[PDB]
Design a protein around this motif. Structure first.
Motif, PDB file in Angstrom:
ATOM      1  N   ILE A 107       0.827  -1.215   0.000  1.00 33.10           N
ATOM      2  CA  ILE A 107       0.000   0.000   0.000  1.00 33.10           C
ATOM      3  C   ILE A 107       0.863   1.268   0.000  1.00 33.10           C
ATOM      4  CG2 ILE A 107      -1.822   1.318   1.166  1.00 33.10           C
ATOM      5  CD1 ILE A 107      -2.784  -1.369   2.342  1.00 33.10           C
ATOM      6  N   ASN A 108       1.857   1.321   0.890  1.00 36.72           N
ATOM      7  CA  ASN A 108       2.828   2.431   0.915  1.00 36.72           C
ATOM      8  C   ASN A 108       3.402   2.736  -0.464  1.00 36.72           C
ATOM      9  OD1 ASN A 108       2.703   3.189   3.609  1.00 36.72           O
ATOM     10  ND2 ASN A 108       4.290   1.745   4.253  1.00 36.72           N
ATOM     11  N   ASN A 109       3.771   1.672  -1.172  1.00 35.21           N
ATOM     12  CA  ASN A 109       4.293   1.753  -2.527  1.00 35.21           C
ATOM     13  C   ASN A 109       3.336   2.421  -3.526  1.00 35.21           C
ATOM     14  OD1 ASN A 109       6.331   1.093  -4.553  1.00 35.21           O
ATOM     15  ND2 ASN A 109       4.940  -0.545  -5.229  1.00 35.21           N
ATOM     16  N   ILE A 110       2.053   2.055  -3.485  1.00 34.32           N
ATOM     17  CA  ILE A 110       1.083   2.619  -4.427  1.00 34.32           C
ATOM     18  C   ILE A 110       0.852   4.097  -4.115  1.00 34.32           C
ATOM     19  CG2 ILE A 110      -1.159   2.352  -5.588  1.00 34.32           C
ATOM     20  CD1 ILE A 110      -1.371  -0.473  -4.370  1.00 34.32           C
ATOM     21  N   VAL A 111       0.722   4.407  -2.828  1.00 37.53           N
ATOM     22  CA  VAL A 111       0.523   5.780  -2.380  1.00 37.53           C
ATOM     23  C   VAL A 111       1.696   6.654  -2.836  1.00 37.53           C
ATOM     24  CG1 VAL A 111       0.237   7.283  -0.392  1.00 37.53           C
ATOM     25  CG2 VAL A 111      -0.870   5.065  -0.403  1.00 37.53           C
ATOM     26  N   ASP A 112       2.905   6.115  -2.711  1.00 33.07           N
ATOM     27  CA  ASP A 112       4.109   6.827  -3.121  1.00 33.07           C
ATOM     28  C   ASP A 112       4.075   7.107  -4.622  1.00 33.07           C
ATOM     29  OD1 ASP A 112       6.920   7.836  -2.620  1.00 33.07           O
ATOM     30  OD2 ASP A 112       7.413   6.145  -3.933  1.00 33.07           O
ATOM     31  N   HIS A 113       3.597   6.131  -5.394  1.00 32.25           N
ATOM     32  CA  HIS A 113       3.461   6.273  -6.848  1.00 32.25           C
ATOM     33  C   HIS A 113       2.402   7.299  -7.237  1.00 32.25           C
ATOM     34  CE1 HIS A 113       5.734   3.070  -9.200  1.00 32.25           C
ATOM     35  NE2 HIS A 113       6.187   2.952  -7.965  1.00 32.25           N
ATOM     36  N   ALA A 114       1.296   7.323  -6.493  1.00 34.27           N
ATOM     37  CA  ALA A 114       0.267   8.338  -6.685  1.00 34.27           C
ATOM     38  C   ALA A 114       0.855   9.751  -6.528  1.00 34.27           C
ATOM     39  CB  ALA A 114      -0.892   8.117  -5.722  1.00 34.27           C
ATOM     40  N   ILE A 115       1.625   9.975  -5.460  1.00 36.44           N
ATOM     41  CA  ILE A 115       2.292  11.268  -5.228  1.00 36.44           C
ATOM     42  C   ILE A 115       3.233  11.618  -6.383  1.00 36.44           C
ATOM     43  CG2 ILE A 115       4.005  12.519  -3.813  1.00 36.44           C
ATOM     44  CD1 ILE A 115       2.817  11.076  -1.349  1.00 36.44           C
ATOM     45  N   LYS A 116       4.064  10.653  -6.769  1.00 37.58           N
ATOM     46  CA  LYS A 116       5.054  10.852  -7.821  1.00 37.58           C
ATOM     47  C   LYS A 116       4.447  11.246  -9.170  1.00 37.58           C
ATOM     48  CE  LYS A 116       8.797   8.086  -5.797  1.00 37.58           C
ATOM     49  NZ  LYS A 116       9.525   6.778  -5.820  1.00 37.58           N
ATOM     50  N   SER A 117       3.322  10.630  -9.525  1.00 41.52           N
ATOM     51  CA  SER A 117       2.688  10.894 -10.811  1.00 41.52           C
ATOM     52  C   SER A 117       1.562  11.923 -10.699  1.00 41.52           C
ATOM     53  CB  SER A 117       2.202   9.587 -11.451  1.00 41.52           C
ATOM     54  OG  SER A 117       1.361   8.864 -10.573  1.00 41.52           O
ATOM     55  N   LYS A 118       1.503  12.599  -9.553  1.00 38.59           N
ATOM     56  CA  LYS A 118       0.517  13.652  -9.282  1.00 38.59           C
ATOM     57  C   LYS A 118      -0.926  13.161  -9.414  1.00 38.59           C
ATOM     58  CE  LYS A 118       4.019  16.722 -11.086  1.00 38.59           C
ATOM     59  NZ  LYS A 118       4.805  15.453 -11.192  1.00 38.59           N
ATOM     60  N   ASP A 119      -1.139  11.892  -9.073  1.00 37.04           N
ATOM     61  CA  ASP A 119      -2.469  11.317  -9.096  1.00 37.04           C
ATOM     62  C   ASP A 119      -3.078  11.431  -7.707  1.00 37.04           C
ATOM     63  OD1 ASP A 119      -4.824   9.937  -9.490  1.00 37.04           O
ATOM     64  OD2 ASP A 119      -3.886   8.072 -10.161  1.00 37.04           O
ATOM     65  N   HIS A 120      -3.666  12.590  -7.422  1.00 36.98           N
ATOM     66  CA  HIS A 120      -4.176  12.874  -6.087  1.00 36.98           C
ATOM     67  C   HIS A 120      -5.609  12.436  -5.878  1.00 36.98           C
ATOM     68  CE1 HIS A 120      -0.583  14.574  -4.372  1.00 36.98           C
ATOM     69  NE2 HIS A 120      -0.347  15.094  -5.565  1.00 36.98           N
ATOM     70  N   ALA A 121      -6.291  12.109  -6.974  1.00 37.98           N
ATOM     71  CA  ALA A 121      -7.560  11.414  -6.877  1.00 37.98           C
ATOM     72  C   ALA A 121      -7.301  10.057  -6.218  1.00 37.98           C
ATOM     73  CB  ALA A 121      -8.193  11.245  -8.257  1.00 37.98           C
ATOM     74  N   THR A 122      -6.278   9.354  -6.703  1.00 35.42           N
ATOM     75  CA  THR A 122      -5.923   8.026  -6.180  1.00 35.42           C
ATOM     76  C   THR A 122      -5.323   8.139  -4.773  1.00 35.42           C
ATOM     77  OG1 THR A 122      -5.649   7.095  -8.410  1.00 35.42           O
ATOM     78  CG2 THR A 122      -4.605   5.874  -6.602  1.00 35.42           C
ATOM     79  N   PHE A 123      -4.477   9.144  -4.559  1.00 37.24           N
ATOM     80  CA  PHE A 123      -3.935   9.411  -3.223  1.00 37.24           C
ATOM     81  C   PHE A 123      -5.049   9.607  -2.196  1.00 37.24           C
ATOM     82  CE2 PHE A 123      -2.309  11.842   0.288  1.00 37.24           C
ATOM     83  CZ  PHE A 123      -1.051  11.323   0.505  1.00 37.24           C
ATOM     84  N   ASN A 124      -5.980  10.502  -2.516  1.00 40.94           N
ATOM     85  CA  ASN A 124      -7.134  10.765  -1.667  1.00 40.94           C
ATOM     86  C   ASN A 124      -8.003   9.523  -1.422  1.00 40.94           C
ATOM     87  OD1 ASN A 124     -10.260  11.596  -1.754  1.00 40.94           O
ATOM     88  ND2 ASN A 124      -9.124  13.081  -0.506  1.00 40.94           N
ATOM     89  N   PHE A 125      -8.252   8.744  -2.477  1.00 39.49           N
ATOM     90  CA  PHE A 125      -9.088   7.538  -2.369  1.00 39.49           C
ATOM     91  C   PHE A 125      -8.510   6.490  -1.408  1.00 39.49           C
ATOM     92  CE2 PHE A 125     -11.403   3.730  -3.266  1.00 39.49           C
ATOM     93  CZ  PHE A 125     -10.453   2.741  -3.505  1.00 39.49           C
ATOM     94  N   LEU A 126      -7.194   6.323  -1.458  1.00 36.57           N
ATOM     95  CA  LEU A 126      -6.497   5.279  -0.718  1.00 36.57           C
ATOM     96  C   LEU A 126      -6.337   5.540   0.778  1.00 36.57           C
ATOM     97  CD1 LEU A 126      -3.626   4.483  -3.250  1.00 36.57           C
ATOM     98  CD2 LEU A 126      -5.437   2.887  -2.587  1.00 36.57           C
ATOM     99  N   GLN A 127      -6.854   6.662   1.269  1.00 35.95           N
ATOM    100  CA  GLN A 127      -6.607   7.030   2.666  1.00 35.95           C
ATOM    101  C   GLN A 127      -7.355   6.163   3.681  1.00 35.95           C
ATOM    102  OE1 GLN A 127      -3.608   8.930   1.440  1.00 35.95           O
ATOM    103  NE2 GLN A 127      -3.992   9.107   3.649  1.00 35.95           N
ATOM    104  N   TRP A 128      -8.610   5.810   3.389  1.00 39.22           N
ATOM    105  CA  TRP A 128      -9.320   4.836   4.221  1.00 39.22           C
ATOM    106  C   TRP A 128      -8.487   3.552   4.309  1.00 39.22           C
ATOM    107  CZ3 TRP A 128     -10.463   0.010   2.376  1.00 39.22           C
ATOM    108  CH2 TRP A 128     -10.464  -0.153   0.980  1.00 39.22           C
ATOM    109  N   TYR A 129      -7.824   3.218   3.202  1.00 41.27           N
ATOM    110  CA  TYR A 129      -7.137   1.937   3.018  1.00 41.27           C
ATOM    111  C   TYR A 129      -5.839   1.921   3.806  1.00 41.27           C
ATOM    112  CZ  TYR A 129      -5.481  -2.206   0.273  1.00 41.27           C
ATOM    113  OH  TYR A 129      -5.017  -3.431  -0.155  1.00 41.27           O
ATOM    114  N   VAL A 130      -5.109   3.036   3.764  1.00 39.04           N
ATOM    115  CA  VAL A 130      -3.915   3.215   4.598  1.00 39.04           C
ATOM    116  C   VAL A 130      -4.275   3.118   6.082  1.00 39.04           C
ATOM    117  CG1 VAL A 130      -2.067   4.797   5.280  1.00 39.04           C
ATOM    118  CG2 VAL A 130      -2.693   4.595   2.886  1.00 39.04           C
ATOM    119  N   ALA A 131      -5.310   3.853   6.493  1.00 40.84           N
ATOM    120  CA  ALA A 131      -5.763   3.873   7.880  1.00 40.84           C
ATOM    121  C   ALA A 131      -6.232   2.494   8.368  1.00 40.84           C
ATOM    122  CB  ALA A 131      -6.869   4.918   8.067  1.00 40.84           C
TER     123      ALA A 131
END
Ligand SMILES: [Fe+3]
Ligand SMILES: [Fe+3]
Ligand SMILES: [Fe+3]
Ligand SMILES: [Fe+3]
Ligand SMILES: [Fe+3]
Ligand SMILES: [Fe+3]
Ligand SMILES: [Fe+3]
Ligand SMILES: [Fe+3]
Ligand SMILES: [Fe+3]
Ligand SMILES: [Fe+3]
Ligand SMILES: [Fe+3]
Ligand SMILES: [Fe+3]
Ligand SMILES: [Fe+3]
Ligand SMILES: [Fe+3]
Lengths: 172, 172, 173, 172, 172, 173
Positions: A107-131
């Motif tokens: 999960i950390n890996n995907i979130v990091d990739h979202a940040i890197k590619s400026k995909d903040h829709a995906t970053f925002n979506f994954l927050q329930w999942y990180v928590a």
């Protein structure tokens, strides 16, 4: 008729589809561990691991929903049968904690990739999942800690199973 | 410590474990069919099939519970990638209806075997499953009937998808 | 446009359609018995048998619903004129109990055929029908037992009819 | 023991007994029409016609009650098998409307005979039946009008069936 | 006065009457096992087994009701005195589990005979009994599994009895 | 591990265990009587006697509970097959009333023994049982009185059975 292209990048699509299959594998693994516990008189652990397995499928479903909403084809892949042979309660929870650590990493890996590619829709979506995953990783750490504190000596298995049973019930 | 032997016969154990795996496979198939629909602007069928896939996993869980309670080890087998390429809405529901016919047959087979071996605990347990599968098979028959009645000519796909959308929502 | 084939086997289809017609025939028989009672001052038995006749039609409807949901064409046959002349209350309930025995046998036959053909959708569906028919067969046994215990000596018919009237009313609510 | 003679005249007895048999025949016809619709993917019309068939049996029962209360023997004759051969939805409703016209005529005939015979108990009794039959005849006129307005071209049968499905549900 | 003949076949009558006597015998066995527990400081197991004994008598009563409703004479034979000699808690539950297995077998036998005889009134009637017996057999399997998991070393009997006490109270 | 000795005297223990077996025997006798009634069209008496049989088992359970709480081993004996052949409703209730008289005497004997041995825990415990048994003995006296007042002339059995049916239903609620 024409349907709109996938709304996510190829790298994020690949990582997300891989994650769906990871969660499905997790469900299988935990159903198998659960069955081991049930057939070895550890119904507390059996129930806990069964309920956890079901929650992993829920994670897979939520990831699938996000893929669907973005017009991204879901790619369900082949997965090996889960391990079915185990040494005992301690070994199962040692293996499970290690497994949760690996899922957290994924999960950390995907979130990091979202940040890197400026995909903040995906970053925002994954927050329930990180928590939620952090909560689960902490939970398995706590259970493993308790199993090791109790030990295997006279009535120890029973005590540990009853402890896990209490957690299983309290988590609805 | 000694745990009690499995409470079901070898043949019934085999058939029930096969059925768990069948339902897991069914879940994957329906998720794949759902995704096809979602990515081809058929979100009504997408939703219906997604919700149906989830229901198949629920069947798998209920079968697992019965295995667990009887001290029968759950034997989850390797997962093979579901079909992901489809021709259209009609083909999807033709394949789905055929799949449901197959599932009904597989249940009839287990119930027949329960009778033959005088395993009436299993016979009695499977009754919810017979009832629910029948409802599902009839449902797929009805949807296929409607898709074929509506046709494919101008607006046909839209009308069919909206019909399926209505069913999906009503079953929630 | 193409509609899906019947979902049940030919033999099961025939038995179920025959059962629909059996229940319709039963409804008419009971209406005729009911009328005999009403016209011979036996309104308790009249009401009981009327309500029972109506329940037989409800059974026919439930069977039709199952046929419809399985894409099975319903085949309704001619219904013969029911017997209309009867000797008395005892004879009517003797005939009715024998009739109920026959209906029970007819259901047993279908359920057995469902098992043999591995049609467990139909087996499962018929369980409400097995249960309700058993209760009906027992009820007619009990009423016949009571009519015969009372007899037709001094006020016997009146007592028996009132007994049946009480049952009729209790089965409503 | 002596029971009181029938309270109605021979002519009125004949007409009412004939009416009971007419309603029973109507119930069978409608069940047959209903089944045709169900087996040809027209479940809206199937449901409508099924519910109507049941209502015709309710009319038969109410007529039987009136005969019973007047000490009039109910004379149930053979009920011939209904027509089962149908061409389509329009033809079914054309036949149905014509059938309802005939039923309306049969009721008008009994009411007229009651007037001529000065049997005002029967006249008064039949008023619910006159009112309810009128509503049914109007309803079949309206459904037939709508089926013909829609027509059979592209999606026409589907639209007509859904329209009739709406009516069926609203009369529940 | 003439009363109607029994509504069940001679074979089914024999099997059901034997079952009534089996349940009465079971009730006595469980009362005896219960008393042993109470008089050896195991009041958790005492309560559990007492409540179970009462439930077996409830099964006998329900079978008697079914015989009565079918005009079948109830044939109560001599009920032999139950075993009273027991070695300990584990032995009691080992014997109990084996006893429940035998009872399950006896029920399977009657249900099979009903099928073979086409007696579906009896088949349908027995379904509550199949379901409830299955639950009881599973329960005894689970309790025995737990007693063996805990063991008899330091405080083991106390822990096992308290566990069974918990179950007893939860089934109230 | 050591458990405390029985808290009651040997003589009281024996009487109470005998009483448990008496109630179990009674339950079976009444089930058999009930069945005779049900199979001879007397469902009112059938129901009454079935419910009474069940209450006898409840008495046995209450006695067992007392034994258990006093650390007294329960000694269940063989239960003889009850009488199953009867002449009729009157004979059944004559037998039942005589049986109830015997049960009352058996309770009087235990209570008397409790007094003589100064076991007032047992004396005090048995008071619900004395009271409930008295009510039962009176009930069977009343039913027998009524059956004999009605007789078996024209509809007599029916009238008596319906009378008993009313009692059965009233004792439920
Ligand atoms: Fe996790
Ligand atoms: Fe997770
Ligand atoms: Fe399915
Ligand atoms: Fe399924
Ligand atoms: Fe019937
Ligand atoms: Fe019936
Ligand atoms: Fe009409
Ligand atoms: Fe009409
Ligand atoms: Fe259009
Ligand atoms: Fe049991
Ligand atoms: Fe049992
Ligand atoms: Fe300890
Ligand atoms: Fe008594
Ligand atoms: Fe008593």
């Amino acid at each position: 008729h024409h349907s709109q292209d996938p709304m996510l990048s190829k790298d994020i699509i690949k990582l997300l589809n891989e994650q769906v299959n990871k969660e499905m594998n997790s469900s299988n693994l935990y159903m198998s561990m659960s069955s081991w516990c049930y057939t070895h008189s550890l119904d507390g652990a059996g129930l806990f691991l069964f309920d956890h397995a079901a929650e992993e499928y829920e994670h897979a479903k939520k990831l699938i929903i996000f893929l669907n909403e973005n017009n991204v084809p879901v790619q369900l892949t082949s997965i090996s049968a889960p391990e079915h042979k185990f040494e005992g309660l301690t070994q199962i929870f040692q293996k499970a904690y290690e497994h949760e650590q690996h899922i957290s990493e994924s999960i950390n890996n995907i979130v990091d990739h979202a940040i890197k590619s400026k995909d903040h829709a995906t970053f925002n979506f994954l927050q329930w999942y990180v928590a939620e995953q952090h909560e689960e990783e902490v939970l398995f750490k706590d259970i493993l800690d308790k199993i090791e504190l109790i030990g295997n000596e006279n009535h120890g298995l029973y005590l540990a199973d009853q402890y896990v049973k209490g957690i299983a019930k309290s988590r609805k």
